[PDB]
Amino acid sequence: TKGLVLGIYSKEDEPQFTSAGENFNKLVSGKLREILNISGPPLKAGKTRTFYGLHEDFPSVVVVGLGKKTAGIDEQENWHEGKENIRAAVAAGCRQIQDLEIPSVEVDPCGDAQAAAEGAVLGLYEYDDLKQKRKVVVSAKLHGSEDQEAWQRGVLFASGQNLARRLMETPANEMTPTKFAEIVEENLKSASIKTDVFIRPKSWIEEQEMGSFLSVAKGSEEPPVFLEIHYKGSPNASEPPLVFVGKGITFDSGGISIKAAANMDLMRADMGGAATICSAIVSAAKLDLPINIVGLAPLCENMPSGKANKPGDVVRARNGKTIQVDNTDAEGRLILADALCYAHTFNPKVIINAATLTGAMDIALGSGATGVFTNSSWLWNKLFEASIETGDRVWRMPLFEHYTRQVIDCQLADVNNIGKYRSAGACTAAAFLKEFVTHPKWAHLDIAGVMTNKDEVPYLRKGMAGRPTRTLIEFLFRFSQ
Amino acid sequence: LVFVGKGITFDSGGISIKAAANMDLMRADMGGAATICSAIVSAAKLDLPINIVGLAPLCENMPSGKANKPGDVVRARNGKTIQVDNTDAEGRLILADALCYAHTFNPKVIINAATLTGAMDIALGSGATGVFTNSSWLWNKLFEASIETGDRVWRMPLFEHYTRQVIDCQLADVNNIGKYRSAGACTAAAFLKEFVTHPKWAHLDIAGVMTNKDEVPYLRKGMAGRPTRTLIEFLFRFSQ
Amino acid sequence: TKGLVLGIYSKEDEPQFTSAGENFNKLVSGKLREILNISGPPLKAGKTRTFYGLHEDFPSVVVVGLGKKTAGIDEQENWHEGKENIRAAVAAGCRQIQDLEIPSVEVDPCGDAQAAAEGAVLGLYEYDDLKQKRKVVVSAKLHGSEDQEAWQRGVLFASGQNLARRLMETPANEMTPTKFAEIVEENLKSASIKTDVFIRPKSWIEEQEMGSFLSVAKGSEEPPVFLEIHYKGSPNASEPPLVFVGKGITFDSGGISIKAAANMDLMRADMGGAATICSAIVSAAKLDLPINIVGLAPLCENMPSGKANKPGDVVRARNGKTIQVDNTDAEGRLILADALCYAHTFNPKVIINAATLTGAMDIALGSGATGVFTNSSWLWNKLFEASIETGDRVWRMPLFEHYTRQVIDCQLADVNNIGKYRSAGACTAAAFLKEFVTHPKWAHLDIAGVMTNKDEVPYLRKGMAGRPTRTLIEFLFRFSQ
Ligand SMILES: [Zn+2]
Ligand SMILES: [Zn+2]
Ligand SMILES: [Zn+2]
Ligand SMILES: [Zn+2]
Ligand SMILES: [Zn+2]
Ligand SMILES: [Zn+2]
């Protein structure tokens, strides 16, 4: 059987159906509006109502509130409101169809086939892999034939996100460093033949003088990996690549500066930064975006042991700078210090890194937006514009020499791994990373607060969220224009 | 133009009592009143040709046998009920009535200042004071004002996302603390938005720029008086 | 308009409707089963499905899964399963009718009019009093005329509970000691003319030598009250009363042993014990139960101040025993010590007290059951049997001299207010109270873990739960037989 998701707008006499809803109402000789009318209150945005037996092929029709037809970019909220309405409403419709165990659903494009595809595929996603109680996986399809490219591009963007949620969600004993490197490799090679994957072993990592990455890694028995992803999509094979770097800690216990036990299981998602940048690169190659992109993810685990990093140790990063490890839980900093050095080798046009770096970001913006520190207002503008379309917001945070001073604490080393005071922890972790970039166009995104979803963005179940993957794909999309 | 300032003259936390460590700095919880009143004294010394009202609710927040209890529902001047879930989120409560009264004056602009939240300190920690504003015009004038004074301002988001977190019904129209711990500056500001209907309001969270240690060199270590010159400079330029 | 809630049983060909569902299906010429059939999967227990436009008078019909028709008493779970199924299913049906803002609902009795009334009235309850956003309050009515007494007795039992949730939920600055005493007075006097209410002031309380109650009270500015409720429902006016005692702390801050800030707002519900026993007595008088019942609730607030109780103080209870107050947050103990002395004055047949005494009860049984300590297996049996009918369980906990030894710590006093070790805190708080009863039939119910509902019992919204009020009404009901 099929289910049909149909949208309507908020209230004229009648609140308007979409063209597809209106066309369905004519095909059932006015029944759909009749029952909608005797059924109760007008549906508002994100609200659904389900009707049965109106048509032989659609035993379940779910009508969904899209909000005001007029909705556009909201200057205060910094997103396109209308598309947010369409993702929210279609996900709520689709999820009613899966609770009735119906295996396929025709979705009305609602005026924007791309965001309706994104609502349906985000909305229906689940991670029930290691459970014996799995949900019915239903397959969403565009209702109609008129903008199947826009539907399929949304399908594409919502899967990139879903790959990243899956990557993040999987338990750390399953998603080890080589296992993640293998999933990404497999996915990237299915995306395009214009790809190259290098799963670099410890041997290579130590030939590259990556001392601060290697010192995080040694306290675990799990072999680290340096994952080098290439998408050569430019016609000019010598066109300078954009490089994405991502913190891939596959589990963070804290090391010897050990984490509290409460809710420590969420640190399986400390490789969110690698999940995010690698999924956006798989999507860019599926999209055959005409640009060269390198992806760099140092993968390792941070564990207490008799060979772990000790508070006070001084390690040497690939640029020769010494780093005093004052707290072993400020490990991503260390990892990214070498990876951001290596990023420069590629002669990049742009360097963007992503990391679940700091609980300070969560106290600061708590999932309303991911924080970005950038030395370039041009980069800031392109990322900000990219998030107005996706609804997955970005908010700029300061790169002031003020926070740098706080981490240039000599004592034994050139730089300290944690700021001198507790204040502005996101700001001093970003200033730490500035010490390893000499590039005029670098952006640091702190993903820690947008790592999980509970109820905040309606089209995502409660779980690891995969954010800001579509802001990154959209940024690449527009850049390759 | 009306300036409003949190004047808690000492904050112990009430029954949600503060930890003992470094509690002496809450003598500076009236920093918001100190800041807006000093800028108005300076504007009148400067004979700036504008009308300015300053509004500072002054009181102390102490545990006693008549103190506010966690869970109480109080009624603000606009009739909204407010569930006091934590008595240490008191400035919120104080400013809720004062920002109602601010509207009586038919103001061109409403700016309030408060040492509201240690979350601001975790967020920007004295590199800048945080400002939440429903107007980019206000943001631009304040930002420009701080380029001259060196005493920086950094915009922070007023998203309905943080509002949802504080519109927790349970007993009241609004809760006094956000549902989750995340984004505490952002949900305290969204709480205050519930009491303004004015198209040009700015909320400055002064908590992280309250003290100086070594960060801005021309100030000894002590209570810093920030962002007073950004405010005087903003008034200066406005009266041009 | 009306909504109709109709139940069906789990699966024969067809899963069976109730008589009312079956009768409605005949009135719509087979439409209801037809649409039920094309609509999706068979409803299981507590699941609902809503159908629109089957009949002019019922634009919304909500069909609800009752589980197996055969369900009876479950030996492992210690409740009547079937009635639990009916409360759960009818509440879920009724709440669909309120989300559509329909103001009245006909409810199918489902084979047990009493539990269907209880599901509907519990299910629909809300506490939105001080909000400007209130829900539509819908009015549930029995579908039919055949067992309107059973429907109305369930209405009665579910309101007693709802009075107690409301009492518990209200903020402590509104529900002060005289305000609560006034609500209870007003309600009891509407229940019967066979009632007497005494709101005893401080003056009386100090003439009665109630030193340990008075020492909790003095640290707050709010005047304490001793509430004495009488329901003379026996034909023999000299028939010995059953007495119910309840801890009425209207807000507990901890005093000088001050509570942590986190979630302290829930201590507005520390008068749950008074709420519970007073609501059961209002219900017993509405039910014109032929017995004499006295209700005793010491009401006060526990606050830090310059006149509050100090850790180490020795106070004197009404029986002359000294009590060392080692921790001021073990105040209910102190309050109940005088009230349980006074209870003996009444020459009672039975003494039952209820108190949100101990977070140790919550660690022990955590809302699966309220804990009862009783020196009588006869009392235990009657309470246990009473909870098999209501589904609101009771679990016996030990009154061993082992826990008594732990609190007979002399040092300055006859008894200490907290046990010597942290272990068995519910057990040593109950052993403390045993020191003030000389009656052969006393039961202590520790209500702390069943104080709130989140998701655990389906027919209650998330909030203060009013438990175990119907176990108490049911116990009185059977006793007066
Ligand atoms: Zn860490
Ligand atoms: Zn980490
Ligand atoms: Zn405070
Ligand atoms: Zn304060
Ligand atoms: Zn207590
Ligand atoms: Zn208590």
Side-chain angles (χ1 to χ4, degrees):
Chain A
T1 39
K2 282 178 286 172
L4 177 64
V5 170
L6 242 30
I8 189 174
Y9 295 102
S10 285
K11 12 94 148 303
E12 257 198 317
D13 172 12
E14 285 163 344
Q16 262 175 97
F17 288 121
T18 54
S19 337
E22 154 76 334
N23 279 215
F24 187 74
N25 192 34
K26 293 173 186 192
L27 214 211
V28 285
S29 313
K31 232 69 216 164
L32 205 243
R33 174 137 250 144
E34 192 167 348
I35 198 179
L36 217 197
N37 267 257
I38 51 126
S39 68
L43 309 177
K44 46 146 296 196
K47 301 291 172 186
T48 62
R49 199 162 297 144
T50 308
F51 301 120
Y52 308 104
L54 296 166
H55 182 69
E56 230 93 285
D57 306 314
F58 301 118
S60 291
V61 169
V62 193
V63 180
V64 307
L66 305 178
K68 289 188 298 187
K69 191 168 226 290
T70 203
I73 288 173
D74 186 320
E75 259 97 298
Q76 315 296 51
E77 301 282 317
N78 295 163
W79 63 11
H80 188 126
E81 189 186 345
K83 296 171 176 274
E84 273 293 290
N85 288 176
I86 292 168
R87 295 171 185 108
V90 165
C94 282
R95 281 204 285 265
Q96 289 287 341
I97 286 314
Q98 179 178 244
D99 295 337
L100 296 157
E101 301 178 353
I102 296 183
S104 61
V105 61
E106 289 213 357
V107 172
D108 163 358
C110 300
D112 199 315
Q114 198 185 140
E118 294 183 7
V121 178
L122 257 13
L124 280 173
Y125 170 77
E126 247 287 296
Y127 210 70
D128 43 11
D129 277 21
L130 309 164
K131 258 199 281 178
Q132 67 174 70
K133 279 290 198 199
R134 338 228 344 85
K135 244 53 44 59
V136 181
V137 65
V138 340
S139 82
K141 262 193 17 194
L142 181 67
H143 181 65
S145 54
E146 185 179 300
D147 222 294
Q148 43 199 290
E149 175 190 271
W151 182 264
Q152 203 62 216
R153 181 168 62 250
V155 160
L156 217 284
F157 279 51
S159 341
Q161 189 170 342
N162 281 339
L163 214 209
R165 299 201 241 183
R166 197 200 62 140
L167 255 31
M168 283 188 224
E169 198 78 68
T170 309
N173 65 323
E174 302 291 340
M175 182 64 55
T176 68
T178 64
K179 234 113 172 49
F180 168 108
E182 288 173 4
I183 307 303
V184 169
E185 178 175 35
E186 171 210 316
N187 275 267
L188 182 71
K189 284 184 177 164
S190 310
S192 162
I193 68 180
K194 302 151 165 198
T195 53
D196 264 338
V197 179
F198 296 105
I199 303 182
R200 310 195 100 120
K202 184 186 197 299
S203 327
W204 178 100
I205 300 167
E206 52 201 0
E207 283 154 2
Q208 296 304 287
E209 278 154 3
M210 290 184 183
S212 18
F213 171 28
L214 243 28
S215 70
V216 175
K218 52 174 193 197
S220 186
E221 289 310 291
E222 186 54 40
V225 157
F226 189 92
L227 173 65
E228 251 253 60
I229 284 301
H230 294 247
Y231 171 57
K232 298 173 169 305
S234 179
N236 335 305
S238 312
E239 189 195 81
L242 296 82
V243 352
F244 284 8
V245 182
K247 173 185 174 194
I249 295 288
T250 49
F251 184 65
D252 187 17
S253 62
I256 285 177
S257 317
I258 202 170
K259 246 116 168 58
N263 288 110
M264 201 191 314
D265 66 288
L266 298 174
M267 292 319 270
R268 75 180 100 112
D270 213 34
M271 33 56 72
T276 265
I277 67 94
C278 291
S279 286
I281 296 165
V282 175
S283 299
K286 285 167 87 222
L287 218 42
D288 275 90
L289 253 33
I291 26 90
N292 292 333
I293 307 171
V294 181
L296 249 31
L299 292 319
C300 76
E301 204 170 80
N302 177 216
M303 294 283 266
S305 75
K307 356 152 41 63
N309 260 161
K310 295 174 311 301
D313 284 359
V314 168
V315 296
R316 187 179 162 254
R318 194 189 190 275
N319 65 175
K321 298 177 104 135
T322 52
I323 305 173
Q324 213 193 309
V325 180
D326 259 4
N327 159 40
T328 62
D329 198 17
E331 90 296 320
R333 265 134 263 55
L334 304 162
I335 252 148
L336 289 177
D338 294 332
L340 285 175
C341 196
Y342 183 64
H344 287 69
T345 286
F346 291 103
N347 279 137
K349 296 185 198 285
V350 151
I351 308 186
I352 290 176
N353 80 276
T356 32
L357 247 218
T358 238
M361 253 315 295
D362 178 64
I363 298 310
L365 263 30
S367 82
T370 130
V372 31
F373 295 79
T374 174
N375 60 359
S376 155
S377 299
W378 181 84
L379 248 182
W380 170 251
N381 268 306
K382 317 318 282 161
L383 269 321
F384 176 64
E385 282 166 37
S387 43
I388 292 183
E389 278 285 283
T390 63
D392 195 354
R393 298 131 143 184
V394 112
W395 194 263
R396 215 226 277 224
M397 291 297 266
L399 215 44
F400 291 164
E401 190 244 22
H402 174 122
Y403 308 104
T404 311
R405 289 189 300 127
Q406 291 179 200
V407 105
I408 242 66
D409 71 309
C410 69
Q411 290 186 175
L412 301 16
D414 298 332
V415 65
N416 209 285
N417 121 289
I418 48 162
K420 177 166 46 43
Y421 315 128
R422 290 159 151 229
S423 305
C427 305
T428 60
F432 176 96
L433 299 171
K434 203 173 89 67
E435 283 301 296
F436 290 93
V437 339
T438 54
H439 185 286
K441 241 98 131 155
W442 159 69
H444 168 52
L445 323 202
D446 208 317
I447 294 324
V450 297
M451 190 180 129
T452 276
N453 187 249
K454 288 130 249 62
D455 76 311
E456 302 105 297
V457 355
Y459 43 92
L460 259 43
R461 255 143 168 144
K462 172 187 298 291
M464 230 74 242
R467 309 215 252 157
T469 310
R470 295 174 299 106
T471 289
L472 271 12
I473 301 154
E474 188 56 39
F475 160 78
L476 286 166
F477 175 75
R478 296 182 176 211
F479 197 105
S480 54
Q481 319 251 65
Chain B
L1 296 82
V2 352
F3 284 8
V4 182
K6 173 185 174 194
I8 295 288
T9 49
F10 184 65
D11 187 17
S12 62
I15 285 177
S16 317
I17 202 170
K18 246 116 168 58
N22 288 110
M23 201 191 314
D24 66 288
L25 298 174
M26 292 319 270
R27 75 180 100 112
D29 213 34
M30 33 56 72
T35 265
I36 67 94
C37 291
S38 286
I40 296 165
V41 175
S42 299
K45 285 167 87 222
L46 218 42
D47 275 90
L48 253 33
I50 26 90
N51 292 333
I52 307 171
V53 181
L55 249 31
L58 292 319
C59 76
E60 204 170 80
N61 177 216
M62 294 283 266
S64 75
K66 356 152 41 63
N68 260 161
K69 295 174 311 301
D72 284 359
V73 168
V74 296
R75 187 179 162 254
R77 194 189 190 275
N78 65 174
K80 298 177 104 135
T81 52
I82 305 173
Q83 213 193 309
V84 180
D85 259 4
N86 159 40
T87 62
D88 198 17
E90 90 296 320
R92 265 134 263 55
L93 304 162
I94 252 148
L95 289 177
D97 294 332
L99 285 175
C100 196
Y101 183 64
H103 287 69
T104 286
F105 291 103
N106 279 137
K108 296 185 198 285
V109 151
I110 308 186
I111 290 176
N112 80 276
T115 32
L116 247 218
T117 238
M120 253 315 295
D121 178 64
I122 298 310
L124 263 30
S126 82
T129 130
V131 31
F132 295 79
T133 174
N134 60 359
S135 155
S136 300
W137 181 84
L138 248 182
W139 170 251
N140 268 306
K141 317 318 282 161
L142 269 321
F143 176 64
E144 282 166 37
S146 43
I147 292 183
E148 278 285 283
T149 63
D151 195 354
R152 298 131 143 184
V153 112
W154 194 263
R155 215 226 277 224
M156 291 297 266
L158 215 44
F159 291 164
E160 190 244 22
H161 174 122
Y162 308 104
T163 311
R164 289 189 300 127
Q165 291 179 200
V166 105
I167 242 66
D168 71 309
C169 69
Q170 290 186 175
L171 301 16
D173 298 332
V174 65
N175 209 285
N176 121 289
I177 48 162
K179 177 166 46 43
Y180 315 128
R181 290 159 151 229
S182 305
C186 305
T187 60
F191 176 96
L192 299 171
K193 203 173 89 67
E194 283 301 296
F195 290 93
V196 339
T197 54
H198 185 286
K200 241 98 131 155
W201 159 69
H203 168 52
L204 323 202
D205 208 317
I206 294 324
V209 297
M210 190 180 129
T211 276
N212 187 249
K213 288 130 249 62
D214 76 311
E215 302 105 297
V216 355
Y218 43 92
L219 259 43
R220 255 143 168 144
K221 172 187 298 291
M223 230 74 242
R226 309 215 252 157
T228 310
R229 295 174 299 106
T230 289
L231 271 12
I232 301 154
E233 188 56 39
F234 160 78
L235 286 166
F236 175 75
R237 296 182 176 211
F238 197 105
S239 54
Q240 319 251 65
Chain C
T1 39
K2 282 178 286 172
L4 177 64
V5 170
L6 242 30
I8 189 174
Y9 295 102
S10 285
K11 12 94 148 303
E12 257 198 317
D13 172 12
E14 285 163 344
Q16 262 175 97
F17 288 121
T18 54
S19 337
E22 154 76 334
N23 279 215
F24 187 74
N25 192 34
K26 293 173 186 192
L27 214 211
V28 285
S29 313
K31 232 69 216 164
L32 205 243
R33 174 137 250 144
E34 192 167 348
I35 198 179
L36 217 197
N37 267 257
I38 51 126
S39 68
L43 309 177
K44 46 146 296 196
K47 301 291 172 186
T48 62
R49 199 162 297 144
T50 308
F51 301 120
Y52 308 104
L54 296 166
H55 182 69
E56 230 93 285
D57 306 314
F58 301 118
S60 291
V61 169
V62 193
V63 180
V64 307
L66 305 178
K68 289 188 298 187
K69 191 168 226 290
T70 203
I73 288 173
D74 186 320
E75 259 97 298
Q76 315 296 51
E77 301 282 317
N78 295 163
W79 63 11
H80 188 126
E81 189 186 345
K83 295 171 176 274
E84 273 293 290
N85 288 176
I86 292 168
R87 295 171 185 108
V90 165
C94 282
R95 281 204 285 265
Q96 289 287 341
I97 286 314
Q98 179 178 244
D99 295 337
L100 296 157
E101 301 178 353
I102 296 183
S104 61
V105 61
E106 289 213 357
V107 172
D108 163 358
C110 300
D112 199 315
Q114 198 185 140
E118 294 183 7
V121 178
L122 257 13
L124 280 173
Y125 170 77
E126 247 287 296
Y127 210 70
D128 43 11
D129 277 21
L130 309 164
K131 258 199 281 178
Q132 67 174 70
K133 279 290 198 199
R134 338 228 344 85
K135 244 53 44 59
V136 181
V137 65
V138 340
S139 82
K141 262 193 17 194
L142 181 67
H143 181 65
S145 54
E146 185 179 300
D147 222 294
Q148 43 199 290
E149 175 190 271
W151 182 264
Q152 203 62 216
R153 181 168 62 250
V155 160
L156 217 284
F157 279 51
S159 341
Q161 189 170 342
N162 281 339
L163 214 209
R165 299 201 241 183
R166 197 200 62 140
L167 255 31
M168 283 188 224
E169 198 78 68
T170 309
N173 65 323
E174 302 291 340
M175 182 64 55
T176 68
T178 64
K179 234 113 172 49
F180 168 108
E182 288 173 4
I183 307 303
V184 169
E185 178 175 35
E186 171 210 316
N187 275 267
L188 182 71
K189 284 184 177 164
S190 310
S192 162
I193 68 180
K194 302 151 165 198
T195 53
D196 264 338
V197 179
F198 296 105
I199 303 182
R200 310 195 100 120
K202 184 186 197 299
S203 327
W204 178 100
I205 300 167
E206 52 201 0
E207 283 154 2
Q208 296 304 287
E209 278 154 3
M210 290 184 183
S212 18
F213 171 28
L214 243 28
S215 70
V216 175
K218 52 174 193 197
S220 186
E221 289 310 291
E222 186 54 40
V225 157
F226 189 92
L227 173 65
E228 251 253 60
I229 284 301
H230 294 247
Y231 171 57
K232 298 173 169 305
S234 179
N236 335 305
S238 312
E239 189 195 81
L242 296 82
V243 352
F244 284 8
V245 182
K247 173 185 174 194
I249 295 288
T250 49
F251 184 65
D252 187 17
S253 62
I256 285 177
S257 316
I258 202 170
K259 246 116 168 58
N263 288 110
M264 201 191 314
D265 66 288
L266 298 174
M267 292 319 270
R268 75 180 100 112
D270 213 34
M271 33 56 72
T276 265
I277 67 94
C278 291
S279 286
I281 296 165
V282 175
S283 299
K286 285 167 87 222
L287 218 42
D288 275 90
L289 253 33
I291 26 90
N292 292 333
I293 307 171
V294 181
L296 249 31
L299 292 319
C300 76
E301 204 170 80
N302 177 216
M303 294 283 266
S305 75
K307 356 152 41 63
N309 260 161
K310 295 174 311 301
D313 284 359
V314 168
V315 296
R316 187 179 162 254
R318 194 189 190 275
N319 65 174
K321 298 177 104 135
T322 52
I323 305 173
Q324 213 193 309
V325 180
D326 259 4
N327 159 40
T328 62
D329 198 17
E331 90 296 320
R333 265 134 263 55
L334 304 162
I335 252 148
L336 289 177
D338 294 332
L340 285 175
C341 196
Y342 183 64
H344 287 69
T345 286
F346 291 103
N347 279 137
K349 296 185 198 285
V350 151
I351 308 186
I352 290 176
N353 80 276
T356 32
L357 247 218
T358 238
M361 253 315 295
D362 178 64
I363 298 310
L365 263 30
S367 82
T370 130
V372 31
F373 295 79
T374 174
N375 60 359
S376 155
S377 300
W378 181 84
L379 248 182
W380 170 251
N381 268 306
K382 317 318 282 161
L383 269 321
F384 176 64
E385 282 166 37
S387 43
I388 292 183
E389 278 285 283
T390 63
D392 195 354
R393 298 131 143 184
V394 112
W395 194 263
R396 215 226 277 224
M397 291 297 266
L399 215 44
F400 291 164
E401 190 244 22
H402 174 122
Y403 308 104
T404 311
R405 289 189 300 127
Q406 291 179 200
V407 105
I408 242 66
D409 71 309
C410 69
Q411 290 186 175
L412 301 16
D414 298 332
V415 65
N416 209 285
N417 121 289
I418 48 162
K420 177 166 46 43
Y421 315 128
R422 290 159 151 229
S423 305
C427 305
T428 60
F432 176 96
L433 299 171
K434 203 173 89 67
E435 283 301 296
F436 290 93
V437 339
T438 54
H439 185 286
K441 241 98 131 155
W442 159 69
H444 168 52
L445 323 202
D446 208 317
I447 294 324
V450 297
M451 190 180 129
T452 276
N453 187 249
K454 288 130 249 62
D455 76 311
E456 302 105 297
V457 355
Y459 43 92
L460 259 43
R461 255 143 168 144
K462 172 188 298 291
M464 230 74 242
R467 309 215 252 157
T469 310
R470 295 174 299 106
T471 289
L472 271 12
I473 301 154
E474 188 56 39
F475 160 78
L476 286 166
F477 175 75
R478 296 182 176 211
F479 197 105
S480 54
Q481 319 251 65

